[PDB]
Design a protein around this ligand. Structure first.
Ligand code: FAD
Ligand code: P95
Length: 426
């Protein structure tokens, strides 16, 4: 039933061989964990979703990896309570399509829909709406967690077991296997957005636009920014902001089915600067999800706290003068954090960059880690495969508190991964 498979993260780096169990039968998963628990802990077990983490959080060299994607039943959707009850292997695209006809919207969508609900919880994912909706864990009402002793515990965010609930959110699979969850969805009358677009000429303008108060008027907001040009052009951005449309805001063509989801010689001169400004400046444009949201590399994402604006500008300056060129760059201002110890988002300047693998890059991102740490920020474990334990621990000062929860729920270290070992979360 288990196959020896070479597994990697999305970045296709640091591979390890594991026995991969792939079964639609939940009882076989219970017994596999029972087999691991009795085997003297060994090199343990980890759950795998769709393999979309860039890191090593869903591989376990010389141990067991449980593929959760065959557990992909939607058990119920209720439009009155807004609740969805789903197997942990359901993906967000499947969930999005099943939920729309009930006038229900997935409360947090990331930059891809090909992620499992189990992965969304364990990485406590965020999206364009973080500053208004928080992260994924904010909307989970219950989950069923297969723990180290082969018992399935029913966890809720408040009441008895809250501590373990909140350790599982952002816990990277290290408290056990999420088998099943109940999610509160966002009500919607349409599958469309009304969107405003803005184009800033500089890092100073981009920052200015995010702190001038206009952010409170939009439920969704993010930006593509320039990380390659010299100042003054460094940090200029195309900002995309909006909210879900109501039926009366749609054009007539679309109002019958409101919830249906189905390089030239001018480019780098004054004329195209104008073109790009015109095309990226608009108000009240009706967009579907695809238009608004879903249009040898090292991914790197960090957040710097809100008040550390001058420090944020400095990190961006360090990035462009490094000789490492990142063309695809996402910037967002995060809102309030949640109570999960290992949750990534904190209020502040969030940035995702992507560097081509090249001489000197590993040592340069270590230096970046140091800057991010010193400025009170942290890195995202769904993007990272190379930070040290000591860096991570200083970035997440509630780690000891989390570790304490993990010891009670897994005394024999049944649940283990390459990431847990590297980051000394074991
Ligand atoms: C193109 C792209 C865009 C992205 N955009 C964003 C974004 O905008 N925002 C954001 O937050 N993230 C983003 N991500 C990261 C992604 O959302 C997370 O890495 C997510 O956790 C991956 O889900 P997965 O099912 O593929 O999980 P995997 O990558 O397979 O596993 C991730 C972690 O979840 C745990 N896990 C998986 N299933 C279970 C389970 N049933 N029980 C317990 N633990 C489990 C694993 O053990 C592992 O620790 C992006 C990734 C890609 C490739
Ligand atoms: O974290 C990410 N995006 C974030 S963080 C906060 C907001 C957003 C975000 O808004 N994503 C996004 N926005 C517009 C178009 C496409 N994606 C991404 N990581 C990767 C990695 N590879 C490809 C795309 C992305 S988006």
């Amino acid at each position: 039933t288990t196959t020896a498979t070479r597994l990697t993260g999305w970045g296709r780096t640091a591979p390890s061989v594991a026995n991969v169990l792939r079964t639609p039968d939940a009882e076989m998963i219970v017994k596999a964990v029972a087999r691991v628990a009795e085997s003297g802990g060994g090199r343990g077990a980890i759950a795998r979703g769709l393999g979309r983490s860039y890191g090593d959080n869903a591989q376990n060299g010389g141990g067991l990896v449980i593929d959760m994607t065959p557990l992909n039943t939607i058990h119920s959707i209720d439009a009155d309570t807004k609740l969805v009850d789903i197997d942990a292997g359901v993906n967000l695209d499947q969930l999005m399509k099943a939920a729309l006809p009930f006038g229900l919207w997935v409360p947090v969508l990331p930059g891809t829909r090909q992620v499992t609900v189990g992965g969304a919880i364990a990485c406590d994912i965020h999206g364009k709406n973080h500053h208004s909706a928080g992260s994924f864990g904010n909307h989970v009402r219950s989950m069923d967690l297969l723990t180290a002793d082969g018992e399935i515990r029913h966890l809720t965010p408040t009441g008895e077991d809250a501590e373990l609930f909140w350790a599982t959110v952002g816990g990277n699979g290290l408290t056990g296997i999420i088998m099943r969850a109940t999610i509160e969805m966002t009500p919607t009358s349409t599958a469309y957005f009304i969107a405003d677009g803005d184009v800033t000429a500089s890092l100073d303008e981009t920052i200015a636009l995010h702190s001038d108060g206009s952010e409170a008027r939009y439920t969704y907001s993010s930006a593509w920014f320039d990380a390659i040009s010299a100042p003054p052009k460094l940090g200029r951005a195309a900002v995309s902001r909006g909210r879900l449309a109501t039926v009366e805001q749609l054009p007539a063509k679309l109002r019958s089915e409101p919830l249906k989801f189905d390089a030239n010689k001018y480019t780098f001169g004054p004329i195209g600067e104008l073109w790009y400004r015109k095309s990226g400046t608009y108000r009240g444009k009706v967009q579907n999800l695809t238009q608004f949201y879903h249009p040898g590399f090292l991914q790197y994402q960090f957040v710097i706290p809100t008040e550390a604006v001058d420090e944020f500008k400095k990190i961006i300056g360090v990035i462009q003068a490094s000789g490492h060129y990142s063309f695809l760059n996402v910037f967002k201002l995060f809102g309030p954090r949640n109570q999960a110890p290992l949750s990534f988002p904190i209020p502040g300047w969030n940035i995702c960059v992507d560097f081509p693998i090249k001489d000197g890059l590993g040592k340069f991102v270590s230096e970046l880690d140091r800057r991010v740490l010193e400025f009170g920020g942290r890195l995202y474990t769904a993007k990272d495969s190379r930070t040290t334990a000591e860096t991570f621990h200083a970035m997440y000062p509630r780690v000891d508190e989390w570790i304490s929860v993990r010891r009670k729920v897994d005394p024999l270290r049944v649940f283990a991964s390459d990431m847990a070992r590297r980051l000394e979360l074991l």
